[PDB]
Amino acid sequence: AALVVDNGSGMCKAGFAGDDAPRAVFPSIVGRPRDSYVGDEAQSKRGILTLKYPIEHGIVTNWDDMEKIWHHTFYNELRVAPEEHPVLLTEAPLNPKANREKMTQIMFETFNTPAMYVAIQAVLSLYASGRTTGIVMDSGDGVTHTVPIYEGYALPHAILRLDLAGRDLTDYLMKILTERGYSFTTTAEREIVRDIKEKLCYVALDFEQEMATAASSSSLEKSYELPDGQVITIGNERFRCPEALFQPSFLGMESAGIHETTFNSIMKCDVDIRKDLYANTVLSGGTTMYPGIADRMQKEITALAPSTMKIKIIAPPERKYSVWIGGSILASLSTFQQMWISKQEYDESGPSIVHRKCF
Amino acid sequence: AALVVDNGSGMCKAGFAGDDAPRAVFPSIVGRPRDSYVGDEAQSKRGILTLKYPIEHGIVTNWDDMEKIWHHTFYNELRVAPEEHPVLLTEAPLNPKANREKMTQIMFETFNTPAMYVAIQAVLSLYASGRTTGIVMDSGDGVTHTVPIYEGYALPHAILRLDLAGRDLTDYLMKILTERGYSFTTTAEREIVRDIKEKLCYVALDFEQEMATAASSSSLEKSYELPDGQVITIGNERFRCPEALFQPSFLGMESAGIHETTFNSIMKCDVDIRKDLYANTVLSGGTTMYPGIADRMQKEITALAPSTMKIKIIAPPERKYSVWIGGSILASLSTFQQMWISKQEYDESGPSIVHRKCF
Amino acid sequence: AALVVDNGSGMCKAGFAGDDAPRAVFPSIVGRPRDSYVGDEAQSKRGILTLKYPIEHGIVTNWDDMEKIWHHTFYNELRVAPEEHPVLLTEAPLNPKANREKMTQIMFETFNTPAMYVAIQAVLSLYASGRTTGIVMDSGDGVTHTVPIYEGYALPHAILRLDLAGRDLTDYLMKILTERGYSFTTTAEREIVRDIKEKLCYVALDFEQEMATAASSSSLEKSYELPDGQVITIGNERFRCPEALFQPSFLGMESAGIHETTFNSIMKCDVDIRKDLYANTVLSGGTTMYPGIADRMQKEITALAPSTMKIKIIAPPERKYSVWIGGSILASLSTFQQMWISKQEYDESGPSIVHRKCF
Amino acid sequence: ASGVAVSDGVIKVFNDMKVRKSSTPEEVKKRKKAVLFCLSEDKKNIILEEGKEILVGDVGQTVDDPYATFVKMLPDKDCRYALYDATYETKESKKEDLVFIFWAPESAPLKSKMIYASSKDAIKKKLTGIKHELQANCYEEVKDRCTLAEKLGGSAVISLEGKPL
Amino acid sequence: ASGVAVSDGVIKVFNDMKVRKSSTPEEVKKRKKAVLFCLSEDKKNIILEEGKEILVGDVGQTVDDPYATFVKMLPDKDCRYALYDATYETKESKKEDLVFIFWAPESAPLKSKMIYASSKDAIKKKLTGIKHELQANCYEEVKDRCTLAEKLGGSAVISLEGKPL
Ligand SMILES: Nc1ncnc2c1ncn2[C@@H]1O[C@H](COP(=O)(O)OP(=O)(O)O)[C@@H](O)[C@H]1O
Ligand SMILES: Nc1ncnc2c1ncn2[C@@H]1O[C@H](COP(=O)(O)OP(=O)(O)O)[C@@H](O)[C@H]1O
Ligand SMILES: Nc1ncnc2c1ncn2[C@@H]1O[C@H](COP(=O)(O)OP(=O)(O)O)[C@@H](O)[C@H]1O
Ligand SMILES: [Mg+2]
Ligand SMILES: [Mg+2]
Ligand SMILES: [Mg+2]
């Protein structure tokens, strides 16, 4: 019975290999008073404590707080002893090799796992869609990555990173909801706005046409009930919030949208494989769950690519947790039990064993 | 002879272009029985009526009551017919474009002004200090804004809003004056406490050192005579009330103080202009009139900024009405008479003319 | 008083003949909104405009934008009227003959220069080192050239071009600085990274030995202060960034390093002159200014060449602007005043006069 | 935006200061090293403040340090626009650049500070080609040579007006 | 804060309920599904109420709905602490979380309600890792399955104990 832990920039997905869904999905935050709270405990206190993301943009920056999250994952969320289960970890693209060895050292020495394995998140999402070649647009909480993959290997020189994901969209929705007279500023009210975003926001196919439709009627207005029973109404903010994914200038960013970032990373690959990448663009992550985002990406990339290229955007219905689900299917295979890094192999080669067993 | 109207979140400043001070300064409230009273009329009745702020946080939320205030401004306060004078209006930062057009429509159709102009409040305050680049900390009655401005244009992605100003400080002073045995609860007693706040309160440079000085002697105690001749004495409440500007936790708020809000909005600007913003921090509004607030802001921001940055807090002596005074100087210029939006231009382009003539 | 203009792929060097250094060194960019900004003006706006290099790889591709840069050079940078001064222009190796005539036509018809002259950049660098025979390794901003020269004439069949220079090293340093947790993505932050590169980066003599030294201590770590006072620390990125000059696979390029490109162009020359080229390898350009690059080139070419050849890498201390300095010494000679292409000679022969007067 | 226009006398002086024409050494001595601009009496135009200028021929004779005597021309309680032709040297080039200086002292009246600040971005758009801008709001922000050198090129500036910093 | 301590028998039972150890299916049937805590006779410790527990092996055999039979164990006129291991399913995950239940019926004597309420925040600090708390002050606030499902995840909870709501 192996454990699968998907360490996201904002959300930790953990569960057991062989299950269809992760058992625990909690915020990857550590809170300390303005003495240490992890996950939903750090959000239950709200404003007394200051919150820190130890893996804010997919890359672990604070290894002391990252061990607190992994300890919280094993004992409080999964409710198991990590010394009895092999653990499959996931890593962001362009993760430095010193971080891969640091993860292997912490798992074998701090938690004493019998076996261990590290996988790349984008490759698991592409395999879960039934592909070995393609480009994965993984938009999560803290970071967005466009990862072109050829024959199961990510092309590292063509991987592009965009510091624009769901966390920035939640803050932008809080900002534009104040234009209607509502006030969402506190930490507890940010969790309400995140729930509004995940239920009522959508991507408009034509933004300027949708802004005219919303200004001439009320067919796009939705009501939302707050935890205390108060009802708010939201109008054009439903499609203005995820529009910042395609127009980052709404947030004051100079960067390109997710469609141009996907196009730019395809243009950094060999000319001979670009035709395959245009037809195998796979969406992944929680921020790709807006209704209408695949049709918008299809239209935007078609306008950037040559007219003779076939643009196909793949948005599988289970793409929110496709990294975790791909890892749990892989870790539950009887043929995969030879791929683990054993503690015996770690005692001989040290933490550098991860580079030859997990690539 | 143009009119200059500064629509504040709690106080309406109105007067004639070319004058040094506004002629009328009255509360921007509309009172209805618990049939419609505006301004000081709504406060003369005290407790019979319920009071509403139509522009409670700088943004107009009730346009029917906002027209009552503008009608009261022209006929009862300025005592002129608005169809004979061009009017310069002011607007809060991050004012939605639908509100700018609504103001232009009301001025040309309801009041029939011959000409009209809309200006941003923070930009007028920065110009009045002799600057085109800087960050304006505008603390008024209902709202506090930190508005970084570069070459005469406010940077909208870096503008921060704090729902903590003089109105919250008046309520907090009423609350802590009851710890001395006094009772201020009614609407008439709130106007007394506001007068105590504007005469005896000050910002302590070191709060904990000032609390020790007040607890060991009576050199900080002041007497105040009530309207009925009764004399009250106030001690450490003099500096505990404006201390909530720097420690909003005194009010149960999770937000940052005005010093951290100023620092956070500088850090949202381009790194190349942050050095200029550190040296050009300009205070504006009635809530920045406490003695010792510029020296406290200087000390607090110095502790947040890198030690190699030069922190300079600008507190001009006329910063309480610097928005109105800047507007009256501008509207009285003979070269400015080409900048007005005429009624002829409004009949052709409609209310959207304000976006290209006033930006 | 003649003018000397060195049109670089990324930087324009301009000044007066007889001076020791160019008066103006500005980026050769034209910016248009996402109406036309040239040079530092195009970089002062940062992210509003899109930037284009009209001479991106040494060869002018957009002649309309190239005239904007030359107009900006004469009137805004040098602050002279070009109709009063003869102008010496420089050109990249393997510049097509249609471009030489286009330059001559623009100088005589658009700017009305009294006289004009075109020189090859690599030949000026070799003359400045006191040589007429040798191979010039000119690494600039957009392009690197290895130009073998025999008796003052570049051998065009042996000239090799490498699209790998300082611009690619700046982008690579931005990429690997994000592995330490820093974020440099915007246009203003790219100018900061370029300043970090020119101050703290160096070429390691043994790369793998230097990577072990940096991983076992902190004697190679340097601090750098950002424009807003924040201090960052850089470690092995100091020598990993210019290492891409010798291992272009760090950038995902299939091409050879600058040492193998130099060796390959020597092997394309006559066998009888290769011994002279091995002993007269001259470095030129801004990208050859890294400390330790001459000792690394010496070691790398020694391993490629036969052991009986004497490898001598010439790195003059003024090699950054050796093209401009060589041109200003030449254009200031009284004996050189007979070499100019006069406007009288241009009216008779047309733009094809440049082929027989400047070769 | 106050609508204050730039007079043709200011545009002519700026065009003569920017581009240097081939001239006899006598006309070179008549080039302007620094010049002040002020509002007209009716406050409708930016005009040349008469008598407040430094000539290139004065530098090295009656004027020892051109930036020190330029700072003395600035009024203590009035706003002003200034055009200073800075001759400085970095580590790898000797430069000569025009500097636009906005002088708005805190002691100046509120009406002057408002009109000069609200009309600054319009005059600077007419003076095309200026790449350096110095906003000085007190005498301490303008009097120091190292304040100008920081605006010109930061720490790369090693000399100013032929004298080391 | 009444100073009432938590016995080591309660801490051992909680540690065995929280973390699941790899065990034979026989020991899995001996895991506790629910357990009640009460005051000792001298009211100095929180102890295990003997006989008032549901085992995992009982679920699916003698026990059809574990939450209904758990509610039956609560006394009508006495306060109690409870530990319930909830197996529920949301729209995107199958969850298994411990729920701390404070049972303080209005019919209970005033002395019991005071001691259990003033010592609740001290026992809950010793039982680290519990993220769900149900304060029930009448039989109608605890008997309904949808009351527990609302506390677990609100409307996202679609199933509880393998049965749809
Ligand atoms: N159903 C949804 N619709 C729109 N956005 C969503 C939805 N669900 C999650 N999001 C956003 O997706 C983000 C987290 O998704 P995730 O892929 O787990 O990121 P990460 O792996 O980096 O932690 C959150 O910001 C969340 O708000
Ligand atoms: N002299 C003063 N000292 C301290 N606080 C003051 C002083 N004067 C006004 N305040 C407060 O300033 C607030 C109103 O100032 P103002 O800038 O006009 O706000 P607004 O523009 O939002 O209406 C009021 O709450 C008032 O009590
Ligand atoms: N002192 C330095 N050390 C290392 N690299 C430098 C240094 N100076 C410049 N570079 C790089 O050299 C490039 C420009 O040099 P240059 O020879 O003028 O190129 P070009 O002629 O093609 O415009 C720039 O990318 C710059 O960053
Ligand atoms: Mg993710
Ligand atoms: Mg105000
Ligand atoms: Mg060059």
Side-chain angles (χ1 to χ4, degrees):
Chain A
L3 310 181
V4 182
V5 181
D6 181 13
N7 300 283
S9 49
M11 222 67 182
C12 180
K13 280 76 62 183
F16 299 83
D19 296 2
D20 299 350
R23 172 165 296 179
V25 182
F26 62 95
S28 57
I29 55 179
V30 178
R32 303 184 195 280
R34 190 78 56 82
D35 61 318
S36 180
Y37 304 88
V38 184
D40 289 313
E41 304 168 350
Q43 272 176 357
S44 295
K45 313 305 177 181
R46 268 71 185 81
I48 139 186
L49 28 60
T50 170
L51 307 181
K52 292 296 175 296
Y53 291 92
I55 184 178
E56 187 171 353
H57 296 293
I59 302 304
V60 177
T61 55
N62 188 6
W63 287 101
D64 299 327
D65 283 357
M66 197 65 227
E67 298 176 34
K68 293 183 179 302
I69 291 186
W70 282 336
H71 181 272
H72 175 79
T73 299
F74 292 138
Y75 294 97
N76 293 324
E77 299 290 345
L78 294 183
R79 296 172 59 185
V80 295
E83 61 268 13
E84 299 180 344
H85 310 267
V87 183
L88 187 147
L89 288 314
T90 70
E91 60 166 6
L94 301 180
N95 191 38
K97 303 183 69 176
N99 287 27
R100 297 178 56 104
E101 303 177 23
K102 185 58 178 173
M103 294 168 58
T104 309
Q105 170 181 330
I106 292 178
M107 282 299 158
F108 282 115
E109 298 175 7
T110 299
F111 300 104
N112 300 284
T113 65
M116 191 245 188
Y117 194 88
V118 188
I120 301 184
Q121 294 158 359
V123 178
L124 290 171
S125 287
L126 191 70
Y127 284 170
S129 68
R131 292 169 175 80
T132 62
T133 297
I135 177 165
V136 172
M137 205 284 290
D138 187 2
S139 194
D141 189 63
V143 67
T144 300
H145 283 109
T146 55
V147 186
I149 298 163
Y150 186 75
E151 303 294 338
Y153 293 108
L155 309 174
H157 72 279
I159 295 173
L160 291 186
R161 162 174 158 175
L162 200 62
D163 285 329
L164 162 57
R167 188 180 306 156
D168 311 78
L169 298 181
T170 300
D171 295 331
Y172 181 60
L173 186 58
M174 297 170 68
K175 183 169 176 293
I176 65 180
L177 281 179
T178 61
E179 305 175 18
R180 296 181 76 95
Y182 309 121
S183 189
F184 301 101
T185 54
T186 67
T187 297
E189 291 168 343
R190 185 178 201 277
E191 305 305 315
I192 298 169
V193 173
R194 183 179 54 85
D195 188 68
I196 299 172
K197 184 193 64 176
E198 301 173 11
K199 291 184 181 306
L200 300 179
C201 288
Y202 68 96
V203 176
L205 190 57
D206 189 4
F207 180 70
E208 299 297 339
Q209 171 185 326
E210 200 72 284
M211 289 288 289
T213 303
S216 66
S217 61
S218 299
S219 57
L220 297 181
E221 287 187 351
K222 292 298 188 64
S223 289
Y224 183 88
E225 182 179 327
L226 301 181
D228 69 330
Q230 294 186 275
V231 179
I232 67 178
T233 173
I234 177 179
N236 65 348
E237 294 83 11
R238 297 177 60 204
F239 55 90
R240 284 170 57 205
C241 162
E243 184 63 23
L245 291 171
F246 301 88
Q247 303 187 48
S249 61
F250 287 3
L251 273 38
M253 298 183 181
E254 304 178 13
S255 59
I258 58 172
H259 63 294
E260 290 165 321
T261 305
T262 304
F263 175 76
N264 288 339
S265 55
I266 292 178
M267 298 306 298
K268 290 187 176 190
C269 299
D270 287 351
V271 59
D272 284 331
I273 73 168
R274 294 178 191 163
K275 181 170 173 291
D276 296 317
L277 301 176
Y278 281 132
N280 295 279
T281 305
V282 182
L283 302 186
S284 183
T287 312
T288 71
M289 294 309 299
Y290 296 101
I293 193 177
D295 287 46
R296 177 69 180 273
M297 282 284 288
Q298 167 88 32
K299 164 188 174 184
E300 293 299 326
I301 297 177
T302 297
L304 293 171
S307 58
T308 55
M309 293 289 97
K310 172 189 175 59
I311 307 303
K312 193 184 179 188
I313 307 298
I314 316 299
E318 19 65 29
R319 67 191 178 275
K320 180 179 182 180
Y321 296 139
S322 59
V323 172
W324 187 94
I325 298 168
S328 69
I329 295 169
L330 185 67
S332 66
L333 296 180
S334 57
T335 59
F336 186 80
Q337 309 310 315
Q338 65 188 15
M339 301 299 186
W340 296 105
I341 301 176
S342 297
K343 186 177 296 180
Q344 171 183 350
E345 302 169 349
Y346 173 82
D347 293 327
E348 306 164 355
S349 304
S352 294
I353 188 62
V354 68
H355 300 307
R356 91 197 64 160
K357 292 219 62 179
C358 303
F359 294 78
Chain B
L3 310 181
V4 182
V5 181
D6 181 13
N7 300 283
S9 49
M11 222 67 182
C12 180
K13 280 76 62 183
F16 299 83
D19 296 2
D20 299 350
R23 172 165 296 179
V25 182
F26 62 95
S28 57
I29 55 179
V30 178
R32 303 184 195 280
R34 190 78 56 82
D35 61 318
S36 180
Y37 304 88
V38 184
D40 289 313
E41 304 168 350
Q43 272 176 357
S44 295
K45 313 305 177 181
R46 268 71 185 81
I48 139 186
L49 28 60
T50 170
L51 307 181
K52 292 296 175 296
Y53 291 92
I55 184 178
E56 187 171 353
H57 296 293
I59 302 304
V60 177
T61 55
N62 188 6
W63 287 101
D64 299 327
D65 283 357
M66 197 65 227
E67 298 176 34
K68 293 183 179 302
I69 291 186
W70 282 336
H71 181 272
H72 175 79
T73 299
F74 292 138
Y75 294 97
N76 293 324
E77 299 290 345
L78 294 183
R79 296 172 59 185
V80 295
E83 61 268 13
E84 299 180 344
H85 310 267
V87 183
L88 187 147
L89 288 314
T90 70
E91 60 166 6
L94 301 180
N95 191 38
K97 303 183 69 176
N99 287 27
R100 297 178 56 104
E101 303 177 23
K102 185 58 178 173
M103 294 168 58
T104 309
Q105 170 181 330
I106 292 178
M107 282 299 158
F108 282 115
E109 298 175 7
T110 299
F111 300 104
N112 300 284
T113 65
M116 191 245 188
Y117 194 88
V118 188
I120 301 184
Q121 294 158 359
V123 178
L124 290 171
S125 287
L126 191 70
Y127 284 170
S129 68
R131 292 169 175 80
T132 62
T133 297
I135 177 165
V136 172
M137 205 284 290
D138 187 2
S139 194
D141 189 63
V143 67
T144 300
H145 283 109
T146 55
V147 186
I149 298 163
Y150 186 75
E151 303 294 338
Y153 293 108
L155 309 174
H157 72 279
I159 295 173
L160 291 186
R161 162 174 158 175
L162 200 62
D163 285 329
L164 162 57
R167 188 180 306 156
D168 311 78
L169 298 181
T170 300
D171 295 331
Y172 181 60
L173 186 58
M174 297 170 68
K175 183 169 176 293
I176 65 180
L177 281 179
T178 61
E179 305 175 18
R180 296 181 76 95
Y182 309 121
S183 189
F184 301 101
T185 54
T186 67
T187 297
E189 291 168 343
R190 185 178 201 277
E191 305 305 315
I192 298 169
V193 173
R194 183 179 54 85
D195 188 68
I196 299 172
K197 184 193 64 176
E198 301 173 11
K199 291 184 181 306
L200 300 179
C201 288
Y202 68 96
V203 176
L205 190 57
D206 189 4
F207 180 70
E208 299 297 339
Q209 171 185 326
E210 200 72 284
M211 289 288 289
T213 303
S216 66
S217 61
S218 299
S219 57
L220 297 181
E221 287 187 351
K222 292 298 188 64
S223 289
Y224 183 88
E225 182 179 327
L226 301 181
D228 69 330
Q230 294 186 275
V231 179
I232 67 178
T233 173
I234 177 179
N236 65 348
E237 294 83 11
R238 297 177 60 204
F239 55 90
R240 284 170 57 205
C241 162
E243 184 63 23
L245 291 171
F246 301 88
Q247 303 187 48
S249 61
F250 287 3
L251 273 38
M253 298 183 181
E254 304 178 13
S255 59
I258 58 172
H259 63 294
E260 290 165 321
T261 305
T262 304
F263 175 76
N264 288 339
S265 55
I266 292 178
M267 298 306 298
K268 290 187 176 190
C269 299
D270 287 351
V271 59
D272 284 331
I273 73 168
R274 294 178 191 163
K275 181 170 173 291
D276 296 317
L277 301 176
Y278 281 132
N280 295 279
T281 305
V282 182
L283 302 186
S284 183
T287 312
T288 71
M289 294 309 299
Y290 296 101
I293 193 177
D295 287 46
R296 177 69 180 273
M297 282 284 288
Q298 167 88 32
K299 164 188 174 184
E300 293 299 326
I301 297 177
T302 297
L304 293 171
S307 58
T308 55
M309 293 289 97
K310 172 189 175 59
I311 307 303
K312 193 184 179 188
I313 307 298
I314 316 299
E318 19 65 29
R319 67 191 178 275
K320 180 179 182 180
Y321 296 139
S322 59
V323 172
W324 187 94
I325 298 168
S328 69
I329 295 169
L330 185 67
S332 66
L333 296 180
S334 57
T335 59
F336 186 80
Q337 309 310 315
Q338 65 188 15
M339 301 299 186
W340 296 105
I341 301 176
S342 297
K343 186 177 296 180
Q344 171 183 350
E345 302 169 349
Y346 173 82
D347 293 327
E348 306 164 355
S349 304
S352 294
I353 188 62
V354 68
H355 300 307
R356 91 197 64 160
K357 292 219 62 179
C358 303
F359 294 78
Chain C
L3 310 181
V4 182
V5 181
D6 181 13
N7 300 283
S9 49
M11 222 67 182
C12 180
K13 280 76 62 183
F16 299 83
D19 296 2
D20 299 350
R23 172 165 296 179
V25 182
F26 62 95
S28 57
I29 55 179
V30 178
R32 303 184 195 280
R34 190 78 56 82
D35 61 318
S36 180
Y37 304 88
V38 184
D40 289 313
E41 304 168 350
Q43 272 176 357
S44 295
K45 313 305 177 181
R46 268 71 185 81
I48 139 186
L49 28 60
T50 170
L51 307 181
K52 292 296 175 296
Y53 291 92
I55 184 178
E56 187 171 353
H57 296 293
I59 302 304
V60 177
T61 55
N62 188 6
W63 287 101
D64 299 327
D65 283 357
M66 197 65 227
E67 298 176 34
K68 293 183 179 302
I69 291 186
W70 282 336
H71 181 272
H72 175 79
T73 299
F74 292 138
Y75 294 97
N76 293 324
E77 299 290 345
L78 294 183
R79 296 172 59 185
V80 295
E83 61 268 13
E84 299 180 344
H85 310 267
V87 183
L88 187 147
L89 288 314
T90 70
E91 60 166 6
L94 301 180
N95 191 38
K97 303 183 69 176
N99 287 27
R100 297 178 56 104
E101 303 177 23
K102 185 58 178 173
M103 294 168 58
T104 309
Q105 170 181 330
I106 292 178
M107 282 299 158
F108 282 115
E109 298 175 7
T110 299
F111 300 104
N112 300 284
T113 65
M116 191 245 188
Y117 194 88
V118 188
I120 301 184
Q121 294 158 359
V123 178
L124 290 171
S125 287
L126 191 70
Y127 284 170
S129 68
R131 292 169 175 80
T132 62
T133 297
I135 177 165
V136 172
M137 205 284 290
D138 187 2
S139 194
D141 189 63
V143 67
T144 300
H145 283 109
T146 55
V147 186
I149 298 163
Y150 186 75
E151 303 294 338
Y153 293 108
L155 309 174
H157 72 279
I159 295 173
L160 291 186
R161 162 174 158 175
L162 200 62
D163 285 329
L164 162 57
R167 188 180 306 156
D168 311 78
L169 298 181
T170 300
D171 295 331
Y172 181 60
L173 186 58
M174 297 170 68
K175 183 169 176 293
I176 65 180
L177 281 179
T178 61
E179 305 175 18
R180 296 181 76 95
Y182 309 121
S183 189
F184 301 101
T185 54
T186 67
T187 297
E189 291 168 343
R190 185 178 201 277
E191 305 305 315
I192 298 169
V193 173
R194 183 179 54 85
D195 188 68
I196 299 172
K197 184 193 64 176
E198 301 173 11
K199 291 184 181 306
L200 300 179
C201 288
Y202 68 96
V203 176
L205 190 57
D206 189 4
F207 180 70
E208 299 297 339
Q209 171 185 326
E210 200 72 284
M211 289 288 289
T213 303
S216 66
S217 61
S218 299
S219 57
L220 297 181
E221 287 187 351
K222 292 298 188 64
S223 289
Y224 183 88
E225 182 179 327
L226 301 181
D228 69 330
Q230 294 186 275
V231 179
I232 67 178
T233 173
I234 177 179
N236 65 348
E237 294 83 11
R238 297 177 60 204
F239 55 90
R240 284 170 57 205
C241 162
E243 184 63 23
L245 291 171
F246 301 88
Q247 303 187 48
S249 61
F250 287 3
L251 273 38
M253 298 183 181
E254 304 178 13
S255 59
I258 58 172
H259 63 294
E260 290 165 321
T261 305
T262 304
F263 175 76
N264 288 339
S265 55
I266 292 178
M267 298 306 298
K268 290 187 176 190
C269 299
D270 287 351
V271 59
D272 284 331
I273 73 168
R274 294 178 191 163
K275 181 170 173 291
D276 296 317
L277 301 176
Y278 281 132
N280 295 279
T281 305
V282 182
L283 302 186
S284 183
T287 312
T288 71
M289 294 309 299
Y290 296 101
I293 193 177
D295 287 46
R296 177 69 180 273
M297 282 284 288
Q298 167 88 32
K299 164 188 174 184
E300 293 299 326
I301 297 177
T302 297
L304 293 171
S307 58
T308 55
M309 293 289 97
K310 172 189 175 59
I311 307 303
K312 193 184 179 188
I313 307 298
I314 316 299
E318 19 65 29
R319 67 191 178 275
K320 180 179 182 180
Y321 296 139
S322 59
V323 172
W324 187 94
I325 298 168
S328 69
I329 295 169
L330 185 67
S332 66
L333 296 180
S334 57
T335 59
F336 186 80
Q337 309 310 315
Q338 65 188 15
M339 301 299 186
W340 296 105
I341 301 176
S342 297
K343 186 177 296 180
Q344 171 183 350
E345 302 169 349
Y346 173 82
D347 293 327
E348 306 164 355
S349 304
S352 294
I353 188 62
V354 68
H355 300 307
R356 91 197 64 160
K357 292 219 62 179
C358 303
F359 294 78
Chain D
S2 63
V4 173
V6 187
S7 67
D8 290 354
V10 169
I11 300 297
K12 177 183 177 59
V13 161
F14 168 76
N15 288 330
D16 296 355
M17 288 184 66
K18 190 163 76 72
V19 178
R20 281 115 169 200
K21 298 296 179 60
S22 61
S23 57
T24 170
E26 177 62 34
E27 291 180 346
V28 178
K29 295 167 57 182
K30 297 177 184 179
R31 289 175 179 172
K32 299 184 184 305
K33 179 69 170 177
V35 62
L36 296 188
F37 309 123
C38 62
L39 284 171
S40 55
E41 293 291 338
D42 49 356
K43 298 180 177 57
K44 306 212 65 175
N45 292 273
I46 302 294
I47 63 172
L48 294 153
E49 180 155 298
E50 185 271 335
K52 296 287 184 175
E53 65 178 359
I54 303 176
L55 299 185
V56 173
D58 301 352
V59 182
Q61 305 176 6
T62 312
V63 163
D64 298 357
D65 182 52
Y67 187 73
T69 170
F70 157 77
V71 169
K72 295 184 180 64
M73 298 192 301
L74 296 178
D76 293 359
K77 298 185 175 185
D78 204 357
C79 297
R80 213 107 302 178
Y81 296 134
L83 223 53
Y84 185 80
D85 204 341
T87 297
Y88 63 108
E89 183 172 356
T90 65
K91 198 175 303 180
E92 57 188 20
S93 60
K94 303 206 301 179
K95 299 237 173 192
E96 293 178 354
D97 289 317
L98 286 174
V99 185
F100 184 87
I101 299 180
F102 181 23
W103 168 247
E106 185 188 345
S107 306
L110 206 57
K111 192 173 182 296
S112 298
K113 285 144 67 174
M114 182 73 197
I115 301 173
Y116 276 85
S118 61
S119 50
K120 168 189 158 296
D121 298 317
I123 178 183
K124 208 191 177 307
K125 270 157 47 187
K126 302 285 294 183
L127 311 185
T128 64
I130 300 180
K131 62 204 64 174
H132 303 297
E133 157 86 56
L134 182 63
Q135 178 185 92
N137 294 280
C138 69
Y139 192 76
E140 323 299 327
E141 291 171 15
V142 76
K143 70 165 183 54
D144 209 347
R145 278 164 48 96
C146 65
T147 302
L148 180 66
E150 169 267 336
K151 182 55 64 67
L152 289 172
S155 57
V157 179
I158 68 181
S159 178
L160 181 60
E161 304 298 331
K163 305 257 75 180
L165 299 176
Chain E
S2 63
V4 173
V6 187
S7 67
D8 290 354
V10 169
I11 300 297
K12 177 183 177 59
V13 161
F14 168 76
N15 288 330
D16 296 355
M17 288 184 66
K18 190 163 76 72
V19 178
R20 281 115 169 200
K21 298 296 179 60
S22 61
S23 57
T24 170
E26 177 62 34
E27 291 180 346
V28 178
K29 295 167 57 182
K30 297 177 184 179
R31 289 175 179 172
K32 299 184 184 305
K33 179 69 170 177
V35 62
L36 296 188
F37 309 123
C38 62
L39 284 171
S40 55
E41 293 291 338
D42 49 356
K43 298 180 177 57
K44 306 212 65 175
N45 292 273
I46 302 294
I47 63 172
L48 294 153
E49 180 155 298
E50 185 271 335
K52 296 287 184 175
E53 65 178 359
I54 303 176
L55 299 185
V56 173
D58 301 352
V59 182
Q61 305 176 6
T62 312
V63 163
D64 298 357
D65 182 52
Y67 187 73
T69 170
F70 157 77
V71 169
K72 295 184 180 64
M73 298 192 301
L74 296 178
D76 293 359
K77 298 185 175 185
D78 204 357
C79 297
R80 213 107 302 178
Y81 296 134
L83 223 53
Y84 185 80
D85 204 341
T87 297
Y88 63 108
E89 183 172 356
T90 65
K91 198 175 303 180
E92 57 188 20
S93 60
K94 303 206 301 179
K95 299 237 173 192
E96 293 178 354
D97 289 317
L98 286 174
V99 185
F100 184 87
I101 299 180
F102 181 23
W103 168 247
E106 185 188 345
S107 306
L110 206 57
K111 192 173 182 296
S112 298
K113 285 145 67 174
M114 182 73 197
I115 301 173
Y116 276 85
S118 61
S119 50
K120 168 189 158 296
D121 298 317
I123 178 183
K124 208 191 177 307
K125 270 157 47 187
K126 302 285 294 183
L127 311 185
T128 64
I130 300 180
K131 62 204 64 174
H132 303 297
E133 157 86 56
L134 182 63
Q135 178 185 92
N137 294 280
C138 69
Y139 192 76
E140 323 299 327
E141 291 171 15
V142 76
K143 70 165 183 54
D144 209 347
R145 278 164 48 96
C146 65
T147 302
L148 180 66
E150 169 267 336
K151 182 55 64 67
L152 289 172
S155 57
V157 179
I158 67 181
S159 178
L160 181 60
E161 304 298 331
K163 305 257 75 180
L165 299 176

